[PDB]
Amino acid sequence: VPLASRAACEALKDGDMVWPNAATVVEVAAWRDAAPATASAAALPEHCEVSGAIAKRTGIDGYPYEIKFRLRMPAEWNGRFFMEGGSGTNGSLSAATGSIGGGQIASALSRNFATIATDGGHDNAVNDNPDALGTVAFGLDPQARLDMGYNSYDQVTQAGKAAVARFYGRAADKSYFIGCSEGGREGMMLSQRFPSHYDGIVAGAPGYQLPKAGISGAWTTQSLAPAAVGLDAQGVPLINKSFSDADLHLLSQAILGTCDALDGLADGIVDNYRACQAAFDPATAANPANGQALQCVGAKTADCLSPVQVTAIKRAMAGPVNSAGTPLYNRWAWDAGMSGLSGTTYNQGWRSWWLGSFNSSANNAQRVSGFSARSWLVDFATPPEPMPMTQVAARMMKFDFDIDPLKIWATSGQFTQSSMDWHGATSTDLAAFRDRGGKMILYHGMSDAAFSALDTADYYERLGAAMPGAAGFARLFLVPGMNHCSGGPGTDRFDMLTPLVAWVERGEAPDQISAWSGTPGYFGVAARTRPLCPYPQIARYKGSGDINTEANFACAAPP
Ligand SMILES: [Ca+2]
Ligand SMILES: [Zn+2]
Ligand SMILES: [Zn+2]
């Protein structure tokens, strides 16, 4: 009966603990000794670990579903509560020490937060249907779609805080959430749907319009097929064969030729992304290594993109339209992080989404036959479209941009909400959140090929338009060169939790956020640090000093 102790912990399993959801089943309530740090993780302090699940049930597809959660409460506690976000189609339960993304080694638990994670309402080892594209099969049960969209995050947040109050004898002082990609989508949902849940939110590469991802996939697949060479084993063009890595490298080298010095400093980084988009056209741009146009004047050479190739990538990058020309997603920024050479290793973190690996007799691009393609067909098209795995690439090739995009707005049968309803987080009404003191940091890599950074930018533009002074509670950090959540030739690592707490608890807004490069080899250097700047600002070299050193740069308007 002493608070914050072994006996208080073990007493949480079963009924002296009163859970807010009566269908909470604790499977584990265990005292854990402090654990040492490892090469990939910081030390963990002594704590009560609780895991279990909420709302065990049987879905209409005959499969079991439940909301799993795991929670960690340190014996020596700073008064703060933390939840980490998801990834992909979720379905797995992590260590739940409180990941802060950004390629960070530290966990929130290592900083004496109480921390929690969920699997989002389904389980990849159980919910795996061979007739419904394996692990996207949760899409066959309506309620599992709801838990994946919002309800699992909500159930798990309430369960955590109630255990925190019981264990420590007081409510948490402040609460925080960080997530990227599908995790970024959840933090944006929380600020909109559950504004008192978290005081501080970080949301990277946010899939805030995730049901549109597969529409862009069918589009980029069909856009690249004329440049393909040869067929796969089902008869479908080898989309991966449309550009060798050498070809994509010619592109990004041409983008650097047009765009790199527009920020004032030729450094392999397009800091002035707006000016870059205004200036770069592959059908006219020069290959800076030779005098000549990037696009072949006649026959194809190695220093030379064919007119078929140039036409294809321009169309992929423009974004999908229907027959009326209505934009269905957004366009994509040209940026050097479409390629990248570190040593002899070409950068795949852009390629892998629309093209897949050149060196293969099959298609393996995310948007052609991989997970995003399958996820669309079973999780976001309503009704679901299960099919054998070998028909997926053909189905993106036949995808009809007048018919099939409607299916992310439809309800049908017992699927009573559309995929945009339960998964979309497009709302700019953040007033409840700001007016209890909430603070939000958005980030996003410029050469992300899952979600367009420019579409996060348009979202932030709509937010500040609807809430004047938005920069007093919400700020957006674009990262030139970064791929999806990590990687690529840019400064893709950063501590997002320290500036967030300062903002929430002390009122210090972030005028910049320090960042560094996970792969400085992309520039041939041992390290690069750069200020991330609050949109619309960009990093600006002070005129003197090592270009790889943050302190020589300041956040400023574009020139
Ligand atoms: Ca530059
Ligand atoms: Zn455990
Ligand atoms: Zn040559």
Author numbering: 43 to 56, 59 to 603
Authors' own words:
Recently, the bacterial strain Ideonella sakaiensis 201-F6 was discovered and shown to grow on low-crystallinity PET films. Two α/β-hydrolase fold enzymes (α/β-hydrolases), PETase and MHETase, work together to degrade PET in two steps via MHET, yielding TPA and ethylene glycol—the building blocks required for a new round of PET synthesis. We have determined crystal structures of recombinantly expressed and purified I. sakaiensis MHETase in its ligand-free form (2.05 Å resolution), MHETase bound to a nonhydrolyzable mono-(2-hydroxyethyl) terephthalamide (MHETA, 2.1 Å resolution) or to benzoic acid (BA, 2.2 Å resolution) as well as ligand-free PETase (2.0 Å resolution) (2a−f). PETase and MHETase only share the α/β-hydrolase fold (2.87 Å RMSD for 184 out of 262 residues aligned).
